[PDB]
Structure 1
Amino acid sequence: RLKALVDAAVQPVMKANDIPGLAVAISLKGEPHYFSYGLASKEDGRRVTPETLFEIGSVSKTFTATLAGYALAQDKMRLDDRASQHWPALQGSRFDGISLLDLATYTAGGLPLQFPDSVQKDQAQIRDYYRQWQPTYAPGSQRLYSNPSIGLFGYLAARSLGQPFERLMEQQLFPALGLEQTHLDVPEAALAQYAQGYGKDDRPLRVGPGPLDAEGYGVKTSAADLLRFVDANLHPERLDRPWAQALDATHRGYYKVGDMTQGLGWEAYDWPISLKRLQAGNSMALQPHRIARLPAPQALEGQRLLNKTGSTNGFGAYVAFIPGRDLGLVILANRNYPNAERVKIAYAILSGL
């Protein structure tokens, strides 16, 4: 019956969006279920499994937010810190007037969707980009989804912990969460599991280097590992206490835009909610939106769906969980297919359950 539900949701969307390979992982009342479809690589006929690695794009921001939650748990930073506190190169810049919370929640005052193409993956170019940046509008007022914004949040969280971001993730966070199939830099030994991504004319696409790529979109992981991360989010209380607190920090809402409540990484909706509303919330116009700030930060628990979409040029990921129902869902594909279609699969499954 579960195969029928998941096949009925996935099969027409894979066919309609020409998705070569797609992995589903579901956590249902504490039990994992895997549904694997199609080809990780069309050219060598390698089938998707629950161990296939996919690029998860901006779903990486939920990992970045968890690392920041770990720095918060250790009192190495606070969300009301001025951003420039954690990086002397920014002292005297406009980051003297911008909080870590503003960076995490895309309200620093108009940091753009992407770094300009002039900014290469280079420490000095990234430093100089932030040193010269000036807000378009007041920090704290308007949300504009931004890689530079949450990328700097992750970079500063790493500085507060005294080590590079990529090292902290590999040496501390991934082991603490029991993730052995989750990578920022896939080992040569794991490359056999790395799915091919597909674009226009099935051009092959694996993500290339970019500024603060690890913080914004660096993670490659399996459906089985990303469900382990969802299960850590459903049950933080099972982890050693600093990591329980790190995960809890990503379950705190700061403001509403439309139906969406913005946390660190995670974006939350009331549940139940219509499919069309969940699609609209995940299909954001890329202009700034005025926020409705919450009088106090809100626990993101109970009758809520927490979710995150993420994409690279070759891949399309979606993760969602319902704390109050102990239900988790991962959908990883090796095509960047529309967010609304990813939500269509997920909604069919979550409503079905």
Structure 2
Amino acid sequence: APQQINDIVHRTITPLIEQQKIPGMAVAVIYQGKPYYFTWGYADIAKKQPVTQQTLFELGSVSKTFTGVLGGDAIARGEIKLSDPTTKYWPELTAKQWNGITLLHLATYTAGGLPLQVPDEVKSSSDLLRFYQNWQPAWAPGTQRLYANSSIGLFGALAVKPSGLSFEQAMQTRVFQPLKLNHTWINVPPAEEKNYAWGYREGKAVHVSPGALDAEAYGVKSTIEDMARWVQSNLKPLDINEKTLQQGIQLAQSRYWQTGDMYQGLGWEMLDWPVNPDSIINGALAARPVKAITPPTPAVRASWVHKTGATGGFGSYVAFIPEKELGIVMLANKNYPNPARVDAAWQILNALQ
């Protein structure tokens, strides 16, 4: 650990943990393509288990990046096309409002107002279909972005249909395995429960609860090591040997839509680098008009590529700059203000060139 990296990391994370009351936290910095790890506090306050490099943390929305990439991998294999209508992979979606809504709109939250979350009452597959048939668009497709688990989560589910595989099998087989993310899961196996940190909310230890389209929108758990590897694969896709997975990573970083200084990829979100920290940090249900990027701009190396995520008891953040071979991962078992995460991440990366 170069003292440089050591000092900026600690100078930054320490006051953060104290101000936010974060019980446990793991940080990885990818510098010149090499990971450096750091860890603080507790994975389980009660059983006094410290956070280590093997601790699993709930990723929350950062899970969408895996989905964007899995989806991009399905495109690469010629199994789906973002230009296909949604109904091509779910012919039972015969309600009229769906004509014109494409897999692209699903993956980028531009379908016309699909809700932030699938309602808790949706139990079964039959319940999911009904929910979608009855959903009433507030806007025409491709006009506004409204961040949503029901939007991407559906994209993920359909993206894997032609393969005959379930979303978990597809994810494990086409993404976790090739990239050697052997400690990343949608369902934490009994053998790895000893490392599953607890989340904390209002002082109580909690874990994410099951829900429809959970795997696809916020269901991944992973370690600081695998997340650092996940960042290295996204920084340098051209080292990935699996052809389709390589294009897939590239496709998830293509710029499909623009909102202010932000560009929407598949899961990942991007801004041109150099970037103002304020342009990312503090400037809900924020509907935002979007401009289509026709055709999409291929992955741009001079970008600040990122994704924020949370569950009831976890706060996570990932951000990297391809052009600089620079990256960072922040995993905490306490959801804390998103602006403090980006503020911390920028302070570290910008300090490393």
CA–CA distance in structure 1, aligned partners of residues 44 and 294 of structure 2: 49
Listed as ranges, the matches of 1:174-253 within 5 Å are 174-200=176-202, 202-239=203-240, 240-253=242-255
* Aligned partner (choices 88, 99, 104) of residue 85 of structure 1: 88
* Aligned partner (choices 273, 282, 297) of residue 280 of structure 1: 282
Listed as ranges, the matches of 1:69-148 within 5 Å are 69-120=72-123, 122-148=124-150
CA–CA distance in structure 1, aligned partners of residues 277 and 43 of structure 2: 29
The one-letter code sitting in structure 1 at the alignment partner of 2:328 is L
The C-alpha deviation readout for 1:51-74, integer Å capped at 9, x for no partner, is 110000010000011111111011
The one-letter code sitting in structure 1 at the alignment partner of 2:315 is G
CA–CA distance in structure 2, aligned partners of residues 291 and 349 of structure 1: 30
Cα distance change on mapping 1:93 and 1:209 into 2, 3 Å: farther
The one-letter code sitting in structure 1 at the alignment partner of 2:230 is F
Residue 323 of structure 2 corresponds to 324
CA–CA distance in structure 2, aligned partners of residues 235 and 93 of structure 1: 42
The C-alpha deviation readout for 1:195-219, integer Å capped at 9, x for no partner, is 110001x111100101100000010
The one-letter code sitting in structure 2 at the alignment partner of 1:208 is S
Check the 8 A contact 1:268/1:300 in 2, yes or no. Answer: no
The one-letter code sitting in structure 2 at the alignment partner of 1:220 is K
SS at structure 2 position matched to 1:33: strand
Residue 255 of structure 1 corresponds to 257
Alpha carbon RMSD of aligned pairs, Å?
Answer: 1.2
CA–CA distance in structure 2, aligned partners of residues 97 and 246 of structure 1: 24
The C-alpha deviation readout for 1:288-326, integer Å capped at 9, x for no partner, is 111122232112322210000010000000000101001
1:332 positional shift: 0.3
* Paired residue total: 348
Check the 8 A contact 2:251/2:298 in 1, yes or no. Answer: no
How high is the sequence identity, in percent, across the aligned residues? 45
Residue 304 of structure 1 corresponds to 303
Work out whether 1:344 is the aligned partner of 2:343: yes
Residue 66 of structure 1 corresponds to 69
The one-letter code sitting in structure 2 at the alignment partner of 1:306 is V
CA–CA distance in structure 1, aligned partners of residues 55 and 300 of structure 2: 31
CA–CA distance in structure 2, aligned partners of residues 195 and 137 of structure 1: 41
Q: Give 5+ residue unaligned stretches, structure 1.
A: none
CA–CA distance in structure 2, aligned partners of residues 196 and 333 of structure 1: 10
Check the 8 A contact 1:85/1:91 in 2, yes or no. Answer: no
CA–CA distance in structure 2, aligned partners of residues 293 and 168 of structure 1: 30
CA–CA distance in structure 2, aligned partners of residues 242 and 264 of structure 1: 15
The one-letter code sitting in structure 2 at the alignment partner of 1:106 is Y
1:117 positional shift: 3.2
Work out whether 1:57 is the aligned partner of 2:60: yes
CA–CA distance in structure 2, aligned partners of residues 32 and 302 of structure 1: 19
Q: Give 5+ residue unaligned stretches, structure 2.
A: none
* Aligned partner (choices 151, 162, 169) of residue 167 of structure 1: 169
Check the 8 A contact 1:143/1:291 in 2, yes or no. Answer: yes
CA–CA distance in structure 1, aligned partners of residues 110 and 244 of structure 2: 27
4+ aligned runs moved over 3 Å, structure 1: none
SS at structure 2 position matched to 1:97: coil
